[PDB]
Structure 1
Amino acid sequence: LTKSTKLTCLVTDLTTYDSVTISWTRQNGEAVKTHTNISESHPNATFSAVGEASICEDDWNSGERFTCTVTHTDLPSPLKQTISRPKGVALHRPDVYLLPPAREQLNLR
């Protein structure tokens, strides 16, 4: 719809610190382009960070393994989050049904 096939990993409830960078690594370990538009802290004393990257349409449909690594001071071990399209699934045509409200609901006006 928008030709904006980007993927991001969001971190919440972490401490409101600085010097945070989110780098995306593929299955071969090669690096990708960086990102911009770093968000700010929230009034609830919770930091928010977003890591943006640009991938190709063919790469996503090829089932490549993409991993997002978090670099936070509190966590001693950088967690790994794997995002990939599950291949081998069939395609079905969605059926859209519209249910009008019942006559028992249009009583209180």
Structure 2
Amino acid sequence: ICEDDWNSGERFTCTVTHTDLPSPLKQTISRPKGVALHRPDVYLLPPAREQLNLR
């Protein structure tokens, strides 16, 4: 799938052909639109001193 074809918001559903289920299932896999872009904030949490005592 082209990169430009995914950002346009198209319905890409896959189908299966199995003998147990006569009716194929459809799974809607589409990227939701209208969302915003937020800069992620990375924080590092050092381990507490209560764990280093156990060694």
- Shorter-chain TM-score tier: over 0.9
Gaps of 5+ in 2: none
Measure the CA separation in 1 of the matches of 2:5 and 2:45.
Answer: 39
Structure 1 position 66, deviation (Å): 0.7
Measure the CA separation in 1 of the matches of 2:17 and 2:29.
Answer: 18
State the partner residue of 1:99: 45
Gaps of 5+ in 1: 1-54
Measure the CA separation in 1 of the matches of 2:11 and 2:46.
Answer: 44
**TM-score, length basis structure 1:** 0.49
Name segments (4+ residues, structure 1) moved above 4 Å: none
Deviations 1:39-92 (A, max 9, x none): xxxxxxxxxxxxxxxx01100000011110111110111000111110011110
**TM-score, length basis structure 2:** 0.95
Q: Report how many residues are paired.
A: 55
SS of 2:36's equivalent? coil
Higher CA-based Rg: 2
State the partner residue of 1:70: 16
- For the aligned residue pairs, the C-alpha RMSD in angstroms reads 0.6
